[PDB]
Symmetry: C3
Subunit: 210 residues, 3 copies
């Protein structure tokens, strides 16, 4: 009952964000639009109940959340890594790491016992490899970005461990509200905050070889 309302709020908010982002930005590759549109699909699937499995302490796990993050967060990571002027091959690497983090997180959420532990460890290893080059970047853009990695991206494995995906210390519904707050921060606030600086950065890189 309660969790349907959370998922409905997610559908509504990301529909508004997608419509806004498409209208506000240039009518070309709009990662902000795609990230939100994909998240709409993900929230509808969770509302539908398409793959709900038993979590810890009697909660539920919605492992398609994590699988769709493999797509939307790769777009986010493209923006972040470009913003920090990583090389093209490091951008691709970081995007691969991102997909791996999300895919193994979905496995860790769904599976049990030692499989959950094993997949959570692999996800965490790839995640350390993902954020270390972001957090240690010498780019002047590192601090604008660090707050998304530290409070947003890193909030997810913390929420995961508390949630039925992990130990089940908090309920399914409270976990879902937490994931929705983190989604708004990493997928919507991120662009309101950084869209213009990222576009200006993209123009400077285009104009200046090297």
């Amino acid at each position: 009952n309660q969790i349907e309302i959370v998922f409905a709020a997610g559908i509504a908010l990301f529909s508004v964000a997608a419509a806004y982002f498409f209208w506000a930005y240039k009518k070309d590759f709009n990662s902000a639009f795609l990230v939100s549109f994909i998240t709409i699909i993900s929230y509808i699937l969770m509302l539908e109940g398409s793959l709900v499995s038993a979590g810890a302490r009697g909660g539920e796990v919605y492992a398609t959340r994590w699988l769709f993050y493999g797509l939307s967060c790769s777009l986010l990571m493209y923006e972040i890594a470009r913003f920090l002027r990583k090389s093209q091959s490091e951008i691709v690497f970081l995007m691969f790491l991102t997909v791996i983090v999300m895919g193994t997180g979905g496995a860790a959420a769904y599976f049990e016992g030692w499989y959950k532990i094993g997949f959570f460890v692999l996800s965490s290893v790839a995640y350390v490899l993902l954020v270390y080059p972001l957090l240690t970047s010498v780019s002047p853009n590192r601090s604008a970005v660090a707050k998304y990695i530290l409070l947003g991206w890193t909030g997810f494995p913390i929420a995961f461990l508390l949630a039925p995906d992990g130990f089940g210390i908090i309920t399914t519904t409270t976990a879902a509200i937490l994931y929705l707050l983190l989604d708004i921060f990493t997928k919507v606030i991120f662009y309101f905050d950084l869209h213009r600086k990222m576009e200006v950065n993209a123009q400077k890189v285009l104009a200046v070889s090297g």
Copy 2:
């Protein structure tokens, strides 16, 4: 009984098209070959009955059709967008839209009630965003292409609404014949018609910077 014959015809025709396209074209990236080869796989899976679900008015839905279109139609969209000399980042955007249209169409086909409606709406929104830059292109190549978008690509959501995927006004078998006709048009006739002009266009773009 009848629908097995339709799917068998699809297997046979796309096997011949793939063999022809591989032989006829250069032994390099051959999108025509890949589009047909992928469609072969899709028809075998539908003949096998791998994920058949109940549609409207007592028909059947073969939602893997739509999922495989996310792969083969991205290759088609690459050809179309390149043909109209869209920028590299607009090509990628249009390819993303294409995958979204097909993925949400497969969800709309499979799911029911308000979920079918919701996913059909999201698919239609992405589809309007996909074809608007194609149909309004100033490229001299726009008219050669418009007939595929207007009669072929747009025939699919019309067939979908009539089919058990949508309202079920026509039977599963009649829908499948219609989808096969649309497949031959958008995946085979398309290349017989446009292959040479697309290759010439690709050569001119390679030779002339700007």
Copy 3:
């Protein structure tokens, strides 16, 4: 019992290989690391028993093995094709073929009767198209590479036909040991053997236009 030990050995070995490859190579796009990390995930899923189906002569089939090869072997194929200085569009083509080979091989393994035969034929056709430009390459690098294609990549369809995936002449456990030997050869020995020559090749291509 016995096969759990094989899968555990795979988990252990690829974890060591991934850790070694990440440490040994440059902290940038590391295909050797990703190939091994992905294979870890695949072995954990097979140990878990996530999609086990009945094979021939009373064996078992682990069709997720083949599906994950579509990802790890595309990275390998990127390295191989680059090593032979194939053009960018031929590299993409070969990578598409690779995904098709693995995807249809997973279908052939899982399905039965004429579907197994049909999908094995399609996989074999794409595989001939994949290796013919590798085996006939005029690159001086062709011979270093030919032993991986001839003994490793081609060992898989042979093992497949013997295994419960195919005729079931050998048991599930013996097939799994054979696949693990082939994995170590094509994914680990490959890099110990060829890593330096591939990096030197990549530097020469970067430095010399044409």
